[PDB]
Every structure is written in C-alpha cells, then in structure tokens.
Amino acid sequence: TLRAAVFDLDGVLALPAVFGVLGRTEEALALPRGLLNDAFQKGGPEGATTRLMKGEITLSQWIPLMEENCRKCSETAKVCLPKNFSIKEIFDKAISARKINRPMLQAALMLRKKGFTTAILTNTWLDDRAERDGLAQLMCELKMHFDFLIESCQVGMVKPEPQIYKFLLDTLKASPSEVVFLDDIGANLKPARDLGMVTILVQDTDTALKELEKVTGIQLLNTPAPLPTSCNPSDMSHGYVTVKPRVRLHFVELGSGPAVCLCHGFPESWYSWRYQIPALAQAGYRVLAMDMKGYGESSAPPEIEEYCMEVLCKEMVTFLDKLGLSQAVFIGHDWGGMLVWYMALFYPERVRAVASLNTPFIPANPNMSPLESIKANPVFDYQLYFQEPGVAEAELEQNLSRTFKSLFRASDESVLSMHKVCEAGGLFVNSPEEPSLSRMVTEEEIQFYVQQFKKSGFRGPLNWYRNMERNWKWACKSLGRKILIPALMVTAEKDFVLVPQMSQHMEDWIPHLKRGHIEDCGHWTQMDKPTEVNQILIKWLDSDAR
C-alpha cells in the first residue's frame, strides 16, 4: 500500500535532460559516439563528476576537470576537438534549455492532494556560475510543491550508492513497499527495487504516468485542468507598515521584480488574491497583497471619515513612502478597483500602471447628487441599506459562516437578491440559515474569512460606502483630467452589479485603455476564474508594466 512518491529532477521533473545534450553535441559536432559521455563519467567513483555530485567541489571548479577529460578521451579516440570548444557554453545552454515537465509536476501535485508524501531525489551540483540564477529559479519553483528535496551535493551521497536510498527512506519515515520511485536512469532504479520499492523507468512522460496511475489507483492522466497554486497563510511573509499614529497596514509579500500592489474589495481580504499571488511572483513580479484599511490584520478605526477615498489614497501613498517604493502597479477589484482609478487620477507619479477587475471608471456627475445617482440604478439599492450605521453590521456579524457562504457564490449558484433589499429589510431575508458550500470555495477557506472578520467585524468595511458626498466633492476636482498612464479594464460577463456595459464610455477618459473580458464570470472574479485572471494580468504586465 503506497503513501509516498519520489521523483528524479533530470529527465523526470525537468526536460530535456541535461544528460541528453552530451549525445546531441557529439552528433551536431560530428564527434565519435559517446566521447563527451566518456569524459563526463571518467574515473567513476573517484572521478571529477562524482566529487561534483557529492559536493566536494563546485560546478566552476569542475568545468576545467571535465575539459581535461575531453582531451584524454580524444588521445585514446584518435580524433580532434574543434577550435571554439566550451564545456561551459554547452552546459550553460543545456541547463537554460531545461524546463519543468508540467504534466509530471501535475501528477506529483495530484498525488500530494490525495495524501501522498512527495519528494525530489536528485544527483546535482553546487552551481556558482555567473548564470546560476536560472536554475535557482527552477529549483525554487519546483521545491515548494514537495515535502522534501534531497540533493546529492547537500547530503554528500550519490545515486546509485545504497546509503542515499536508506537516507531517503528514513527522511520519508516509510517502508520501501509504501514508496513509488521514478527515474530515467536504470542504474539508479535498481537499488530502490532491491529494497522492495515500486520503481518506474521514465522514457516518455505518458507511459511513465500510465504506469504511475495503474500502480497508485489515482487519476493523473487526462484529468481536468488544475486550479493555479493557492496560498497557505502561515507560509507567507507578513508585512506591517504604520501609515499614521493610529493606522497600521498589513500585507502579504511574494517575489522579486517590479512592485505589484493588490487591492481587494468588499467584504474581502488579501486572501481573495490567493490564486494570483504565486502566479504573478512566478511571472517576475514583487506582489504586495494588502489587507485594506478596516480589514483583517490592518487597523480598523470606528469613524466614518477615516474611510473617505482621499484619506484611503493618501495612506496608500504613505505606505509606498515607508516601504521606499517610488512606484507600484495598482490592481484593484470592487472597492479596491475604485481606489485604484483614484490613485491613477491623483497620484500618477506613484502608479506605474493601473488595472481593475469588474469596477469601471465612472466620472462623478457634477449635476447629480451621489444619492440621486444611486436612484438611477436598481442594482445599487443595497448601498442605501449600508448607509445607516449598525443595521448592516448586525445582519453581517450575526452569523459569519452564513454571511460568506451566502455571498461567495458563482453566477448560477446565487441564493440572494440585490433588489429591494431595504424593502426586504436585509440581504439575507430570502436566504437559508445553512447555505450550501459553493464550488468556488472549500470549508477551510470560508473559515479563514470568518477568523479574519472576528477581529474588527463589518464597521470599517461598511464605512467605505459611507462617504458618498465627500468622495463626490473630491472626485469633482479631477473632472478636467484624463488617465494617460498604462491602464487595463477587466470585465466579468455575469457580474450583475458591476456589469460590463457600465465600462462602455471609459475610452473618453482613458483613450489608451486596454481591455480584458471574462465569460461565465460572476462578481468574485479572482476565485471564479483564477486561470483566466492570471493569464490576462500576466500578459498585460509583461507588455505595459515591465
């Protein structure tokens, strides 16, 4: 009965195998078959390659030792190497060409999700090349998905030596019979087999996965498209910035590169961006996912005036000042989308680029009171119910689990009406006391929002809706301006409050506006269609932000 899956890196989790390159170089350079291959394995266990794999020497120290072996292999071969020969250049591009074998990674991910203990067992080196970051990035990406990474150069043991297998079994705390081991090199499979471990010779991925699926009884081949990597809150870097004596802002941070500031809506969390954070960090960005003022670990003062847009924007500017950031890309959703257009309008120097999900940019009407403007739309009637302090708080704070389960639902799952909510006397009047769990969220994810909202409740979050008149007056100062920095508007087909049609006149204010559109997507864009959101944002960031 299996409970652990072990994978090799070269030829299994990463393709093409760096090993394959030596045979490819020989035939491309019309050299005798296996010559470069011989130089690589010369001296066997006391040879330069074994010393490299054991961590006795670095890759840079090894390069001249392999080069010498190439000369010695030619003396015996009675053939000559051509002029511009560089072992460094061959390995540099071999390593650079090697990419993650995505279907093998997905299978490993699927096995772990079903309760397996996963590990990478690899014969590798200490890379001190000027170009080492490429592989550091690859190892960094792959390792986060496994319980253990066992590298020969760190443990001082190599495959096929039997001690590394006993080391692996001890690390796994599993009997050989409980372990499936996958490798592309027959010689390295043999010692695992002798212990009674299930082994898979990996030639082509599909056959290897077919063998893996047969032997584990779990579906890995032809499975539905997986969700992007999500965030485990306790594994994140948590940051805290005091923006003013009584206001502290909390954020989660991941990656290196240009600063990307994520701004959630109502009633959300930094966690609402869980599917974007790893994807954007992997795409070459430094993600700062905020807990907006009034939410989670951020300060939640009681006063309504603490939540007017001008104050919220000034605080986000102070946040950049204190982190030493001259700019950041601002990406918002719902209330965050509103703040984000206003950041672009009042602080264009601090905004590298601006993107919004669902929230359009609609310029304030100088001739219509914000309350009259709410009158113009039946969808925005819930905003009038939010005006009276205490009313909405009482209903939303009464049962937290019910609140989030009722709100966080895909377009076709809605148990709630946004109409005559004031007439009905609440947004949970027509709703069950025990809502069913939406296909968008696990029970664990709902419970995270519940624990977050237990600290400050809905007062601070509801206060964002309580400054309509102040926001309107402030916005009227920008009526002569245009947004001329890079901008993206992402519309969601099934958002029945923030409808795509509301964005139609945006090009009059943002002439160079870029667009994105998501079909079959409700209000909760980030969790509804994460794969699509990531694809649109990454593509726009690489073209307009970078």
Ligand X SMILES: NC1Cc2ccccc2C1
Show contacts with ligand X in window 484-543 (CB under 6 A): none
- Tell me whether residue 542 is annotated as binding: no
List Cβ<8 Å contacts ≥24 apart for 58-65. 58/125, 58/126, 58/127, 58/128, 59/91, 59/125, 59/126, 59/127, 59/128, 59/129, 60/128, 60/129, 62/125, 63/87, 63/88, 63/91
Cα–chain center distance at 143: 14
* Spatial contact of 506 and 359, defined as CB atoms under 8 Å apart: no
Task: Kindly name the residue from 291, 334, 495, 528 that is annotated as catalytic.
Answer: 334
Distance from C-alpha of 1 to C-alpha of 195, rounded to nearest angstrom: 15
Task: Kindly name the residue from 465, 495, 528, 544 that is annotated as catalytic.
Answer: 465
Annotated catalytic, 275?
no
- Residue 238 lies near a second copy (rule: CB under 8 A): yes
Tokens of 475: 């916005």
Which residue matches tokens 């310029």? 363
Q: 378: cis peptide before it, omega within 30°?
A: no
Show contacts with a second copy in window 113-142 (CB under 8 A): 126-128, 132-133, 135-137, 139-140
Annotated catalytic, 512?
no
Tokens of 257: 């590169």
Q: Hey, what amino acid is at 131?
A: E
| Residue 286 contacts which entry, ligand X, a second copy, none (Cβ below 5-8 A, type-dependent) | a second copy
- Residue 543 lies near a second copy (rule: CB under 8 A): no
Least Å from the CB of residue 445 to ligand X: 29
Q: Which is nearer to ligand X, 175 or 373 (CB)?
A: 373
Which residue matches tokens 């993600």? 287
DSSP 44-57: GGGSHHHHHHHTSS
- Three-state SS at 127: coil
Q: Which residues pair with 5 in a beta bridge?
A: 118, 180
Binding part of the chain for a second copy, among 52-60, 94-102, 105-113, 356-364 by CB under 8 A, reads: 52-60
- Tell me whether residue 123 is annotated as binding: yes
Identify the residue among 253, 393, 397, 413 touching a second copy (CB under 8 A). Answer: 253
**Breaks in the chain after residues (C–N exceeding 2.5 Å):** none
| Residue 475 contacts which entry, a second copy, ligand X, none (Cβ below 5-8 A, type-dependent) | ligand X
Tokens of 500: 């795509």
Identify the residue among 55, 265, 370, 461 touching ligand X (CB under 6 A). Answer: 370
- Residue 6 lies near ligand X (rule: CB under 6 A): no
Distance from C-alpha of 108 to C-alpha of 145, rounded to nearest angstrom: 8
- Sign for the CA dihedral angle at 498, 499, 502, 507 comes to positive
Lay out the site mask for ligand X across 324-353 (x = CB under 6 A, - = otherwise).
--------------x---x-----------
Tokens of 388: 């009276």
Write the DSSP symbol of residue 121. Answer: E
- Residue 309 lies near ligand X (rule: CB under 6 A): yes
| Residue 472 contacts which entry, a second copy, ligand X, none (Cβ below 5-8 A, type-dependent) | ligand X
| Residue 326 contacts which entry, a second copy, ligand X, none (Cβ below 5-8 A, type-dependent) | a second copy
Annotated catalytic, 449?
no
| Residue 234 contacts which entry, ligand X, a second copy, none (Cβ below 5-8 A, type-dependent) | a second copy
Cβ contacts of residue 170 below 8 Å, gap of 6+? Answer: none
Identify the residue among 472, 509, 524, 540 touching ligand X (CB under 6 A). Answer: 472
Binding part of the chain for ligand X, among 84-92, 180-188, 346-354, 466-474 by CB under 6 A, reads: 466-474
Instruction: Specify binding-site residues for substrate.
Output: 382
Instruction: Enumerate binding residues for ligand X (CB under 6 A).
Output: 309, 338, 342, 364, 370, 468, 471-472, 475
Residues placed in the known binding site for phosphate = 122-123
Return the active site residues. Answer: 334, 465, 523
Interface residues toward a second copy, by CB under 8 A: 51, 55-58, 60-61, 126-128, 132-133, 135-137, 139-140, 143-144, 154, 156, 234-242, 253-256, 258-259, 281, 286-287, 320-327, 346, 348-350, 352, 477, 480-485
